[PDB]
Amino acid sequence: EYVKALPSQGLSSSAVLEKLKEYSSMDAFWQEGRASGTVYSGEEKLTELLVKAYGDFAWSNPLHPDIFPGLRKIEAEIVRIACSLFNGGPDSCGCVTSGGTESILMACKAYRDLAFEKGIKTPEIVAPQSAHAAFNKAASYFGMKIVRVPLTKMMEVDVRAMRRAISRNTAMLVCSTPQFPHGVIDPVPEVAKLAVKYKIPLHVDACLGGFLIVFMEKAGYPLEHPFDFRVKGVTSISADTHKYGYAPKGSSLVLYSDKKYRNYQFFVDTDWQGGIYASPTIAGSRPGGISAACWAALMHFGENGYVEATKQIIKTARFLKSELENIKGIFVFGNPQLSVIALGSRDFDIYRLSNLMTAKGWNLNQLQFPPSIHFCITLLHARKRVAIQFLKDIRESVTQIMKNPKAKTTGMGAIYGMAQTTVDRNMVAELSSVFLDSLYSTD
Amino acid sequence: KEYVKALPSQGLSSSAVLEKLKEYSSMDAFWQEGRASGTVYSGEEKLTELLVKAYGDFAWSNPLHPDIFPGLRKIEAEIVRIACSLFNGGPDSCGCVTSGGTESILMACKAYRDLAFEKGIKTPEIVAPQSAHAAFNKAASYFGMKIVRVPLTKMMEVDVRAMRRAISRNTAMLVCSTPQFPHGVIDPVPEVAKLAVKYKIPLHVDACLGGFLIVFMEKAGYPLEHPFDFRVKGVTSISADTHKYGYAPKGSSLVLYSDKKYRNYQFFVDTDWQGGIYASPTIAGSRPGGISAACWAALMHFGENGYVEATKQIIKTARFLKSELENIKGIFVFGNPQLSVIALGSRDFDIYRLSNLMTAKGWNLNQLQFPPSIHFCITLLHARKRVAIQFLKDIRESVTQIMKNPKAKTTGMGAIYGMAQTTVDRNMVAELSSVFLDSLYSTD
Ligand SMILES: C[C@@H]1CN(c2nnc(Cc3ccccc3)c3ccc(Cl)cc23)CCN1c1ccc(C#N)cn1
Ligand SMILES: C[C@@H]1CN(c2nnc(Cc3ccccc3)c3ccc(Cl)cc23)CCN1c1ccc(C#N)cn1
């Protein structure tokens, strides 16, 4: 069953593609629209365009701008288009990255280097509890301390608690538009007031929300507060084109209010024997085809395509939100204004609902601290009209659970519940490593 | 043409988008003719069509979700196992698929730093040859490690006596390259591994460049004098680029370990995240699954026979050029390159005048430094396009022209690379590099 060595004799192109169809046939699940997030559009004609766009630039590598000046122009444009969407102005700038993690790591690294220059020995990240796991990856990789501040009952960062966490060591403040767990937008203007007063950079994580939030007003769903470069104090924004931009996986952006901030993310080796070496991001060689396909997605959708995609997603999310808020036995966490809806229960163990949804063919995210489950609506969910079945299955599952509310939680839901209660955090860390080792298994 | 600075009011059709992209692709250099050193390793039409179809079949697959994409998870487990076997790893060996050589190097450095922290070392050190990739400096800077760059011998190989003297209670890892990029010289892996074993320090072998050539050298009829892989006791990790001599798409590489105990330190785990228990093996979260599918397609399509044949063709081209370049008065070759890279110097004139004349003749050679040098890296493209003859004619012509006035002033870009080495203030060179990086994002 497993290929464990290079074949003695190479397979023909047709034989290779025949074998790959057997692998791709096991990766079909998402097509019915039963997976939370994961695939943002997945539309046939869009995929054909993005694959052709990638193919046209397959061998292009932005490590060589002299060999590929066309790709260099494509990337400069993706960044400028994004700065304009976030109302940056002429001083704003940015970089194309491989994903939201890289966009976050680059900002954290820039802010650490700026803090070092100021005499801070151990720079600190002050972020809400809800901030992406990538902020912990940044702390661990870059040797920064991470302070995670508690949330309000509405799943927003408690701004009084954030103010109390700021110190002489604080290198950056964080907030999310929205945070992934509950799909709640953090109070950007209130956090930016702290950023301005204490003269600390502020990173806005719009990896998830980016290509929705920017089109909210034009779609007829304006947000109550500003969230972008128009907010004084916001120094950087991360936004995922691979999400609501409908671009291929492997594409994201890190945007800065000024070049002075971006300079600290750059890597330079002036003395290398292999020549003067300069790189703007983590990678050296990069897949230029991915940037070409990202540019193709932006150009193909345009302002009208994105406003329309946003209208469709928001109509679906608001419909589900109002319906999920009228089901006895469950409640929705905070006030989600975007594509993500998180659920809880004070009457039963919520993981019993995700257990029943799994049995009905759905893949919902199992959250923790507090026990919760979520579903993230994409353009695929809007197109396939999955909301009706999602609602019927939730209602059925909740009805079944409400017959025996004190009954034992079984399967995977029991594991996620136990993992939160476990006093030894090292056992959970050990089982995560075992899970990661299992992914590379050829046994 | 002019710059797109904002999202169009109305989205362009698929055909309009592709028409516009052809204008961007048409402005890219004549790499197809084989005049660019390294950069593109095959670029063959029918191979590209297969890899694009392989990518397309897995376009939306994301290895962050192995439960949604178990087929891609199988593909990646296999790429790693195939590579471990090529480096003679055995059942205990393991690895990860990465986005490139830089990531493969950063992951090993990060694993070795975390292992050193666990042992009480506060500021872990990297002990590497002067020739080691720039990515080792990126690792030092990112991860808060000290980098000790050890000098080379006259043959451009690590000075093993200097490396023994550089080792300390702080040393987290030893490094050597198979081969180093500047001169294409293979470092003495068994000699460095003797230090690794004695001092109980991990050893990383950088085979990013050489990986998919070195592994096929013996079968191609060009066996190397010494072992270089997991069969060498002390070698704990190997980085190898599939996107190079594997002919896989850009965005693919490997980091391999002799034992799972080493790989565990590269992993990232967030047990307490509100968004769920989060575990990631490499730097990225979401990853382009299509790239891994196309990498698996390249490996399967070439097989041992296609790789051994590609290696035979590259080495024949490399050895022919080496012997010819060693018989030109006015130039010399650095060390004894046994692979695809040949570096040149001159004791009679400024070498950068040769790269200036080669650029005027339509060639793109790498301009090295410390010492002043230039190089050309042979790919399957150079062997298929059969540019060896023209490369040799152009080198001979250029050297003849330069030898008429050996003390004459170096102009253009060659003068800049020469001055950059002599400049006492290294901060000015660092400032101009930032200015160069800012220029890449220009829409003016
Ligand atoms: C313009 C030169 C060049 N430069 C660059 N640095 N790295 C790479 C990436 C790379 C390096 C080596 C081998 C392979 C890839 C480049 C790639 C392409 C290119 Cl056109 C440039 C690059 C950095 C800025 N720069 C200089 C020049 C002089 C001074 C001074 N005094 C400072 N900087
Ligand atoms: C299997 C679970 C979960 N797990 C995983 N960790 N991260 C991601 C990446 C990710 C996380 C959250 C949101 C999006 C992506 C996963 C992705 C998919 C999947 Cl099937 C698993 C993942 C690994 C560890 N693990 C557990 C479980 C229980 C205990 C104990 N007691 C310890 N570990």
Curated annotation (Swiss-Prot), chain A:
Cytoplasmic side: 1-443
Chief place of localization: endoplasmic reticulum
Record note on quaternary structure: Homodimer.
Stretch of the intact protein here: 111 to 553 of 568
Species the sequence originates in: Homo sapiens
Modified residues (3'-nitrotyrosine): 246, 256
Residues annotated with N6-(pyridoxal phosphate)lysine modification: 243
Keywords: Acetylation, Apoptosis, Disease variant, Endoplasmic reticulum, Lipid metabolism, Lyase, Membrane, Nitration, Phosphoprotein, Pyridoxal phosphate, Signal-anchor, Sphingolipid metabolism, Transmembrane, Transmembrane helix
Family recorded in the similarity comment: Belongs to the group II decarboxylase family. Sphingosine-1-phosphate lyase subfamily.
Variant or mutagenesis effect after changing residue 243 to L: Loss of sphinganine-1-phosphate aldolase activity
Biological process terms in GO annotation: androgen metabolic process; apoptotic signaling pathway; ceramide metabolic process; estrogen metabolic process; face morphogenesis; fatty acid metabolic process; fibroblast migration; hemopoiesis
Required cofactor(s): pyridoxal 5'-phosphate
Pathway(s) where this gene product acts: Lipid metabolism; sphingolipid metabolism
Entry's EC annotation: 4.1.2.27
Name of the protein in its database record: Sphingosine-1-phosphate lyase 1
Curated annotation (Swiss-Prot), chain B:
GO aspect biological process, one term: kidney development
EC number of this enzyme: 4.1.2.27
Keyword terms of this UniProt record: Acetylation, Apoptosis, Disease variant, Endoplasmic reticulum, Lipid metabolism, Lyase, Membrane, Nitration, Phosphoprotein, Pyridoxal phosphate, Signal-anchor, Sphingolipid metabolism, Transmembrane, Transmembrane helix
Membrane topology of the entry: Single-pass type III membrane protein
Listed cofactors: pyridoxal 5'-phosphate
Cytoplasmic side: 1-444
Molecular functions (GO terms): pyridoxal phosphate binding; sphinganine-1-phosphate aldolase activity
Residues where 3'-nitrotyrosine is found: 247, 257
N6-(pyridoxal phosphate)lysine found at: 244
GO cellular component entries: endoplasmic reticulum; endoplasmic reticulum membrane
Compartment(s): Endoplasmic reticulum membrane
The keyword Hydrolase is annotated on this UniProt entry: no
Catalytic activity annotation: sphinganine 1-phosphate = hexadecanal + phosphoethanolamine; sphing-4-enine 1-phosphate = (2E)-hexadecenal + phosphoethanolamine
Tissue: Ubiquitously expressed. Expressed in fetal and adult adrenal gland (at protein level).
Metabolic or biological pathway, per its Swiss-Prot or TrEMBL entry: Lipid metabolism; sphingolipid metabolism
Associated disease: RENI syndrome: An autosomal recessive, steroid-resistant nephrotic syndrome that manifests in infancy or early childhood, and progresses to end-stage renal failure within a few years. Additional clinical features include ichthyosis, adrenal insufficiency, immunodeficiency, and neurological defects. In rare cases, patients present with isolated primary adrenal insufficiency. Some patients present in utero with fetal hydrops and fetal demise.
Main function: Cleaves phosphorylated sphingoid bases (PSBs), such as sphingosine-1-phosphate, into fatty aldehydes and phosphoethanolamine. Elevates stress-induced ceramide production and apoptosis. Required for global lipid homeostasis in liver and cholesterol homeostasis in fibroblasts. Involved in the regulation of pro-inflammatory response and neutrophil trafficking. Modulates neuronal autophagy via phosphoethanolamine production which regulates accumulation of aggregate-prone proteins such as APP. Seems to play a role in establishing neuronal contact sites and axonal maintenance.
Family statement: Belongs to the group II decarboxylase family. Sphingosine-1-phosphate lyase subfamily.
UniProt name for this protein: Sphingosine-1-phosphate lyase 1
Organism of derivation: Homo sapiens
Gene name for this UniProt entry: SGPL1
